[PDB]
Scaffold this motif. Structure first.
Motif, mmCIF file in Angstrom:
data_model
loop_
_atom_site.group_PDB
_atom_site.id
_atom_site.type_symbol
_atom_site.label_atom_id
_atom_site.label_comp_id
_atom_site.label_asym_id
_atom_site.label_seq_id
_atom_site.Cartn_x
_atom_site.Cartn_y
_atom_site.Cartn_z
ATOM 1 N N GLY A 34 0.776 -1.219 0.000
ATOM 2 C CA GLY A 34 0.000 0.000 0.000
ATOM 3 C C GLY A 34 0.811 1.275 0.000
ATOM 4 O O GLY A 34 0.222 2.361 -0.085
ATOM 5 N N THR A 35 2.133 1.191 0.093
ATOM 6 C CA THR A 35 2.984 2.367 0.056
ATOM 7 C C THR A 35 3.491 2.608 -1.362
ATOM 8 O O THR A 35 3.458 1.725 -2.222
ATOM 9 N N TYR A 36 3.966 3.827 -1.603
ATOM 10 C CA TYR A 36 4.516 4.197 -2.896
ATOM 11 C C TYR A 36 5.714 5.111 -2.692
ATOM 12 O O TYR A 36 5.801 5.829 -1.694
ATOM 13 N N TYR A 37 6.633 5.076 -3.650
ATOM 14 C CA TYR A 37 7.819 5.915 -3.573
ATOM 15 C C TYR A 37 7.435 7.380 -3.724
ATOM 16 O O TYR A 37 6.493 7.722 -4.444
ATOM 17 N N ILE A 38 8.174 8.247 -3.039
ATOM 18 C CA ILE A 38 7.803 9.650 -2.904
ATOM 19 C C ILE A 38 8.482 10.441 -4.015
ATOM 20 O O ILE A 38 9.704 10.610 -4.012
ATOM 21 N N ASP A 183 3.742 -12.560 -10.118
ATOM 22 C CA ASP A 183 2.490 -13.135 -9.649
ATOM 23 C C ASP A 183 1.493 -12.096 -9.162
ATOM 24 O O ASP A 183 0.297 -12.398 -9.090
ATOM 25 N N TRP A 184 1.944 -10.893 -8.820
ATOM 26 C CA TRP A 184 1.063 -9.877 -8.262
ATOM 27 C C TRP A 184 1.396 -8.515 -8.846
ATOM 28 O O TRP A 184 2.568 -8.184 -9.042
ATOM 29 N N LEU A 185 0.356 -7.734 -9.121
ATOM 30 C CA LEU A 185 0.485 -6.353 -9.557
ATOM 31 C C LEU A 185 -0.285 -5.460 -8.597
ATOM 32 O O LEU A 185 -1.385 -5.811 -8.158
ATOM 33 N N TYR A 186 0.292 -4.308 -8.274
ATOM 34 C CA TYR A 186 -0.295 -3.371 -7.329
ATOM 35 C C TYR A 186 -0.533 -2.038 -8.020
ATOM 36 O O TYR A 186 0.279 -1.602 -8.839
ATOM 37 N N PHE A 187 -1.654 -1.397 -7.694
ATOM 38 C CA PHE A 187 -2.033 -0.128 -8.296
ATOM 39 C C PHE A 187 -2.558 0.826 -7.235
ATOM 40 O O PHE A 187 -3.234 0.409 -6.290
ATOM 41 N N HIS A 188 -2.245 2.109 -7.400
ATOM 42 C CA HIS A 188 -2.904 3.189 -6.677
ATOM 43 C C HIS A 188 -3.657 4.054 -7.677
ATOM 44 O O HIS A 188 -3.071 4.530 -8.653
ATOM 45 N N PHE A 189 -4.948 4.255 -7.432
ATOM 46 C CA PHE A 189 -5.768 5.165 -8.220
ATOM 47 C C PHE A 189 -6.451 6.132 -7.268
ATOM 48 O O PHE A 189 -7.243 5.711 -6.417
ATOM 49 N N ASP A 202 4.908 -3.941 -10.804
ATOM 50 C CA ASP A 202 4.810 -5.358 -11.123
ATOM 51 C C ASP A 202 5.805 -6.209 -10.350
ATOM 52 O O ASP A 202 5.627 -7.431 -10.280
ATOM 53 N N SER A 203 6.840 -5.600 -9.780
ATOM 54 C CA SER A 203 7.803 -6.290 -8.934
ATOM 55 C C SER A 203 7.975 -5.500 -7.647
ATOM 56 O O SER A 203 8.165 -4.282 -7.677
ATOM 57 N N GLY A 204 7.907 -6.198 -6.519
ATOM 58 C CA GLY A 204 7.942 -5.537 -5.231
ATOM 59 C C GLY A 204 6.591 -4.952 -4.882
ATOM 60 O O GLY A 204 5.775 -4.698 -5.771
ATOM 61 N N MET A 205 6.339 -4.735 -3.598
ATOM 62 C CA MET A 205 5.028 -4.272 -3.160
ATOM 63 C C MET A 205 4.867 -2.768 -3.362
ATOM 64 O O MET A 205 3.827 -2.330 -3.870
ATOM 65 N N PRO A 206 5.843 -1.943 -2.983
ATOM 66 C CA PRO A 206 5.685 -0.495 -3.174
ATOM 67 C C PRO A 206 5.498 -0.147 -4.642
ATOM 68 O O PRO A 206 6.102 -0.758 -5.526
ATOM 69 N N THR A 207 4.655 0.848 -4.899
ATOM 70 C CA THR A 207 4.338 1.259 -6.257
ATOM 71 C C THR A 207 5.094 2.529 -6.632
ATOM 72 O O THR A 207 5.660 3.225 -5.787
#
Ligand SMILES: *[C@@H]1O[C@H](CO)[C@@H](O[C@@H]2O[C@H](CO)[C@@H](O[C@@H]3O[C@H](CO[C@H]4O[C@H](CO)[C@@H](O)[C@H](O)[C@@H]4O)[C@@H](O)[C@H](O[C@H]4O[C@H](CO)[C@@H](O)[C@H](O)[C@@H]4O)[C@@H]3O)[C@H](O)[C@H]2NC(C)=O)[C@H](O)[C@H]1NC(C)=O
Ligand SMILES: *[C@@H]1O[C@H](CO)[C@@H](O[C@@H]2O[C@H](CO)[C@@H](O)[C@H](O)[C@H]2NC(C)=O)[C@H](O)[C@H]1NC(C)=O
Ligand SMILES: *[C@@H]1O[C@H](CO)[C@@H](O)[C@H](O)[C@H]1NC(C)=O
Ligand SMILES: *[C@@H]1O[C@H](CO)[C@@H](O)[C@H](O)[C@H]1NC(C)=O
Ligand SMILES: *[C@@H]1O[C@H](CO)[C@@H](O)[C@H](O)[C@H]1NC(C)=O
Ligand SMILES: *[C@@H]1O[C@H](CO)[C@@H](O)[C@H](O)[C@H]1NC(C)=O
Ligand SMILES: *[C@@H]1O[C@H](CO)[C@@H](O)[C@H](O)[C@H]1NC(C)=O
Length: 269
Positions: A34-38, A183-189, A202-207
């Protein structure tokens, strides 16, 4: 119903296929989820207190992905599936990896974000194409019962979620590549002052930041298109679609960066 154009009437019923309701899963951001790079900043071997659009730790994910075979249930195109957008959403998507002639194919559910889903309003669509992530925000003529199909293994019905024969006027159209192997993709909208923002990884949890799009209007609804496909069932192949979604909100997070700038842990204050 989504949109208002009568695209087809083939194999439509009102059966409540969801005898087991919307599957649920608990958010856990202890490992950076659920985190993302700043912005373009880099932090090394330190813990930062940061305020941004993050999921609420301890809240529930909802598996809005829907899989059909021939029939579409009218219940799929109403609440609770048709959901409010509010500030934004965080999405955890499984990359359903199929095989044809031992060749890998990547598929997962499409998501549409909009307010009224008619050709006088802009609707954002994020659709995968087996390694190519097509993103458009265009004045589509959305069908009552939009749905995608399964290009690798095929489907019993044609693909249809918009009826525009001529190319609709619109603002944004770009293609982004993603690693088909993961195996997993994460998105913030999320949206802020009439501007739409998108992050993904697409790699790692942070977006990381994908793009920003000015709309000048308030988005109010999002929906995950059902996917009809001959495969992806326990009777033919033990594979399933998964599209976990949780609301976003302005929250303060403790972010820890390792000695290489990777967010390894996070805490929801
Ligand atoms: C932007 O989006 C809007 C919707 O939000 C679109 O408007 C719709 O466009 C469709 C297609 O042109 C319209 O459907 C057509 O309506 C015609 C008029 O309907 C009257 O007549 C029928 C009897 O024929 C009555 O039952 C009805 O109550 C009305 O009194 C129909 O004559 C058309 O029928 C023909 O096409 C159908 C297609 O399936 C065939 O089955 C028929 O046999 C026949 O050949 C057709 O049904 C629809 O009414 C429009 N809705 C609105 C609200 O306007 C815009 O087209 C779209 N524009 C762009 C540029 O994308
Ligand atoms: C982005 O990706 C889409 C999907 O692959 C491309 O759309 C296809 O383009 C090819 C070649 O022009 C056509 O044969 C297909 O009919 C198109 N649609 C599909 C579903 O494959 C698109 O060209 C790419 N580029 C842009 C700018 O959108
Ligand atoms: C949609 O169009 C089909 C074919 O013309 C028709 O049979 C069906 O009744 C229409 N649906 C509605 C809700 O009018
Ligand atoms: C990281 O920080 C810890 C705590 O201050 C310190 O013990 C360690 O040596 C640091 N390592 C690097 C590579 O900076
Ligand atoms: C799908 O499209 C093909 C080509 O137009 C057509 O022959 C077929 O009848 C269509 N089937 C359905 C279920 O829409
Ligand atoms: C793609 O993902 C697989 C599995 O996670 C990994 O082994 C591979 O190195 C990745 N390749 C790229 C280019 O990201
Ligand atoms: C799916 O897994 C179950 C349990 O292991 C098994 O009984 C079934 O045969 C499997 N189906 C396929 C298509 O492999």
């Amino acid at each position: 119903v989504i949109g208002d154009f009568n695209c087809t009437n083939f194999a439509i019923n009102d059966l409540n296929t969801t005898v087991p309701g919307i599957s649920e899963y608990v958010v856990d951001v202890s490992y950076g989820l659920g985190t993302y790079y700043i912005l373009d900043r880099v932090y090394l071997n330190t813990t930062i207190l940061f305020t941004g659009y993050f999921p609420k730790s301890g809240a529930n994910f909802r598996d809005l992905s829907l899989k059909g075979t021939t029939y579409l249930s009218t219940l799929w195109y109403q609440k609770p599936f048709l959901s409010d957008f509010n500030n934004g959403i965080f999405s955890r998507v499984k990359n359903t990896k199929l095989y044809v002639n031992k060749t890998l194919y990547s598929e997962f559910s499409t998501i549409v974000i909009g307010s009224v889903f008619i050709n006088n309003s802009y609707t954002i669509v994020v659709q995968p194409h087996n390694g190519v992530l097509e993103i458009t925000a265009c004045q589509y003529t959305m069908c009552e019962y939009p749905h995608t199909i399964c290009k690798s293994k095929g489907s019993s019905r044609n693909e249809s979620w918009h009826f525009d024969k001529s190319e609709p006027l619109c603002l944004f159209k770009k293609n982004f590549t993603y690693n088909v192997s993961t195996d997993w993709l994460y998105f913030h909208f999320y949206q802020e002052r009439g501007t739409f923002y998108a992050y993904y990884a697409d790699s790692g949890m942070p977006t990381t930041f994908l793009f920003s799009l000015y709309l000048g209007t308030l988005l109010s609804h999002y929906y995950v298109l059902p996917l009809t496909c001959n495969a992806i069932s326990s009777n033919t192949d033990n594979e399933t679609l998964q599209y976990w979604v949780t609301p976003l909100s302005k929250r303060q997070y403790l972010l820890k960066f390792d000695n290489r700038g990777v967010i390894t842990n996070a805490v929801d204050c």
